[PDB]
């Protein structure tokens, strides 16, 4: 059977809701929909957002109000839903949904970002580590994994408009690029680069300069599967026409 999964850093759900998010949701009709940066507290959401017809909905808010948060809409509910890696300082910021769909585990992650300081960076990298360890334990037990969401890092030079002036800014630091190397070398696949080899493919553009209309952007949103499972991924694309956020959605399509 074909399964369509979408992943989107919505940059505040309320905000994307005001730009026809429901219209588009109903149009595309994916089997699972992963969301990052809900920003709003779930018990505050317009009811039509929390109660979408045909979809059970899962919300994982941060402690801070107005901040972070992840969400998942799925036609068929999972066996269970985890909201953490098991290390405290990472699990309390509503960044983690690990949902068990029997055939695979679905990681909906909103990774942090290492900007403004070194501690911020340290936390991002330690987060990366805690995630890698978590996904490996699950994979080593013979489970198949799908990781999607905002990784906050463009992998290679081919993954952003301006690499040269950015390699000392967080998002493209060699350290951050080095991790994605490690991550892959542990047995995981950037699904999109399985089918697309072109440059100029982005998932985020700065609102601040109308960067999208020029396509001066970054690829920060990824779908990852474990190598043993790549045979079953049919499509992996970027829905770059879909407006409403500073990120656009990206999609995965799998078999059985």
The site for Mg ion (CB under 5 A) is made up of 11, 37
CB of 219 to Mg ion, least distance (A): 14
Query: Is 150 noted as a catalytic residue in this protein?
Result: yes
Q: Is 136 annotated as a binding residue?
A: no
Shortest Cβ 134–Mg ion spacing (Å): 24
* Contact (CB, 8 A) for 74 and 55: yes
Nearer to Mg ion, 37 or 221 (CB): 37
Distance of alpha carbon 147 from alpha carbon 78, whole angstroms = 15
C-alpha triplet 105, 148, 220: angle, nearest 5°:
165
Instruction: Report whether 150 belongs to an annotated binding site.
Output: yes
**Which of 63, 73, 147 minimizes the C-alpha distance to 111?**
147
Nearer CB in complex with Mg ion: 9/201: 9
- Tell me: is residue 11 an annotated ligand-binding position: yes
DSSP state of 218: B
Residue closer to Mg ion by CB (options 170, 226) is 170
Q: How far is the CB of 171 from Mg ion (least distance, A)?
A: 12
Q: Any residues with CB less than 8 A from the CB of 171 and at least 6 apart, and which? A: 113, 115, 152, 153, 154, 160, 218, 220
Nearest residue to Mg ion, by Cβ distance, number only: 11
Point out the catalytic residue in the list 31, 134, 150, 221: 150
Residues in the chain: 256
Residue ranges for the binding site for Mg(2+)? 11, 37, 150, 152, 247
Residues designated catalytic: 150
Residue ranges for the binding site? 11, 37, 150, 152, 247
């Amino acid at each position: 059977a074909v399964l369509k999964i979408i992943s989107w850093n919505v940059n505040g759900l309320r905000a994307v809701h005001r730009k026809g998010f429901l219209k588009w949701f109903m149009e595309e009709k994916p089997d699972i929909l992963c969301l990052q940066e809900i920003k709003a507290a779930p018990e505050q959401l317009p009811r039509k957002l929390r109660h979408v017809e045909g979809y059970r909905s899962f919300f994982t808010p941060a402690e801070r109000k107005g901040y972070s948060g992840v969400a998942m809409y799925t036609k068929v509910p999972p066996s269970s839903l985890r909201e953490g890696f098991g290390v405290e300082r990472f699990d309390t910021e509503g960044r983690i949904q690990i949902a068990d769909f029997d055939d695979f585990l679905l990681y909906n992650i909103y990774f942090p970002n290492g900007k403004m300081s070194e501690e911020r960076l340290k936390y991002k990298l330690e987060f990366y580590d805690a995630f890698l360890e978590d996904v490996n334990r699950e994979r080593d037990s013979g489970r198949n994994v799908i990781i999607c969401g905002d990784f906050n890092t463009a992998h290679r030079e081919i993954d952003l408009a301006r690499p040269k002036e950015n390699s000392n800014v967080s998002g493209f630091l060699p350290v951050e690029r080095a991790w994605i190397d490690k991550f892959i070398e542990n047995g995981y696949v950037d699904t999109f680069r399985m089918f697309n080899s072109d440059p100029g493919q982005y998932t985020w553009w700065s609102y601040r300069t109308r960067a999208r209309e020029r396509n001066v952007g970054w690829r920060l949103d990824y779908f990852f599967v474990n190598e043993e499972f790549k045979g079953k991924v049919k499509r992996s694309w970027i829905l770059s026409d879909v407006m409403g956020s500073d990120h656009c959605p990206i999609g995965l399509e799998i078999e059985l």
